[PDB]
Amino acid sequence: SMITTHPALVLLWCQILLLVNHTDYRWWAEVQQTPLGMCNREIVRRGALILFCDYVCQNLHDSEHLTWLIVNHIQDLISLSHEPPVQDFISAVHRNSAASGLFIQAIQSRCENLSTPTMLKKTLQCLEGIHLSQSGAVLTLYVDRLLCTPFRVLARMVDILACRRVEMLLAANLQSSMAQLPMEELNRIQEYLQSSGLAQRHQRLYSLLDRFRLSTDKDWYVHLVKSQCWTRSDSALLEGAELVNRIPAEDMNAFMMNSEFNLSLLAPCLSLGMSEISGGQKSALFEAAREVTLARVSGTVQQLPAVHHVFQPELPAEPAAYWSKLNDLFGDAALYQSLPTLARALAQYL
């Protein structure tokens, strides 16, 4: 009952209840909240986790506290990793095999919570050097979970840590490496690398991993512009426009009308049509992009509901079940991703 009006006296009482070895997991549970809040309760939770980690730092030969503290409070452990007592606790987990394996297991169970950039950078600084018998588990965690982030520096850091991990895997004994890392899991890692685009983005991991494995002209131009233009999405924008520019242009509506077409190239195609028309003689690129732009606009309004009702962003779902239709075909990421592409196209056209 003292926890809310004063935190600092309850932190003193936590250290007193630690200095005499009173460790009842019911009281530490009701303090540290085992699975908008207040501020004093947060100060007490952080202080209790810090002082408990220092208690396990002092007397570590009794090893139930390591398992319980790592399994239960894992996210709230790594969120505080820039304080000295939990830093000594972290360096103490780095000297055990089963505790570090349970630690990487606990990160694997709660990786979806470590999506913010700060908590992920603190896990990368917390998985920086671990026990050498656990290198296969952290490599599987690196290539499975922590490599698909949109942030590039965290991908670069986990790339450097994974390459140093395979480097430390190779320098050890081969019978130690083969007994921990199975071959079928290695083919799983390699098919996950070659499946996504991270194989050609990172040469070093695939090179070191295959090293560890081996230790144990007309239509051709049409195919080339089909390779360059017909993708999902790319940065080649003016380049794709100049590539479709020198098409024979008796067959354009055959090429533009495709189920898998970069509609993002339509606005650079219209810009090149504008440059050719305002320079000299007319182009076919402009009329082709005009035809397919207006046809796709007519198509995407044919998918709209017929009897339109006015938007109100104060009470949206109130008047009818029309918002079921304006969430079904409208919150889908495909049509929503296709709409402002056509808005760029119609912006250039108008």
Binding site: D217, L224, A236, E239, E242, L243
Partner: protein
């Protein structure tokens, strides 16, 4: 006497290609090949563009490669194309020394695809500058294909 002043001012234009933010380089690269074609005979601009296209003191040669493509395409009259082919021979003997090897084979593929024949070779040239570095086996395939297409040009 006006010819050496023209050489001096073309050198100042290339100096403003040397320094210069990429919008300014886009402008000078766009306005360059018409000026070089219209002002004076192409031997001087040929010497200048080879001597200032392969410099290691160069930020990026991509718009300069487009300049190379347009200045080769405006020199495709008949005796002018034989002079172009002799300049290709001289510049490939200049290409015999090795640059940094990925940019070397890239710029050599650009030089092959630019000074080339009519029907479908020129349209590949935006795709060749679509990657500046990033050497891949497909780039080796494109380079060997434009090489064997230039072997039947001679």
């Amino acid at each position: 006497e006006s010819v050496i002043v023209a050489m001096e001012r073309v050198s100042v234009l290339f100096d403003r290609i040397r320094k210069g933010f990429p919008c300014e380089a886009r402008v000078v690269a766009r306005i360059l090949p018409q000026f070089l074609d219209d002002f004076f005979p192409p031997q001087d601009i040929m010497n200048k563009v080879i001597g200032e296209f392969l410099s290691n003191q160069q930020p990026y040669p991509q718009f300069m490669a487009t300049v190379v493509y347009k200045v080769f395409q405006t020199l495709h009259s008949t005796g002018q194309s034989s002079m172009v082919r002799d300049w290709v021979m001289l510049s490939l003997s200049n290409f015999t020394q090795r640059a940094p090897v990925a940019m070397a084979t890239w710029s050599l593929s650009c030089f092959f695809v630019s000074a080339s024949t009519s029907p479908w070779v020129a349209a590949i040239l935006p795709h060749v500058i679509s990657r500046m570095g990033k050497l891949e086996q497909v780039d080796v395939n494109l380079f060997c294909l434009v090489a064997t297409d230039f072997y039947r040009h001679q």
